Nucleic acid binder design. Structure first.
Length: 74
RNA sequence: GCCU
């Protein structure tokens, strides 16, 4: 999977722990990117909370762009 | 595992 962008900031629109995925709104493009639980760095469960600010890379998965290496902004 |  190709890295599209790096160190992108965004706000978690929602993340459902039951389905194991959610969406993050990129602050730079205002577009939603898919985020799966496996793509989140640990100590985060592998989860993020609604409305929180996260930093992440954007990569090209099988069904389009998605987040990777998702953490807090520090 | 693409709108809860």
């Amino acid at each position: 999977k190709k890295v599209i962008a790096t160190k992108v900031l965004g706000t978690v629109k929602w993340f459902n722990v039951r389905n194991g995925y959610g969406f993050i709104n990129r602050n730079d493009t205002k577009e939603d990117v898919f985020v799966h639980q496996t793509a989140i760095k640990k100590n985060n469960l592998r989860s993020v909370g609604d409305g929180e600010t996260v930093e992440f890379d954007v990569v090209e998965g099988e069904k389009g762009a998605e987040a990777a290496n998702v953490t807090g902004p520090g």
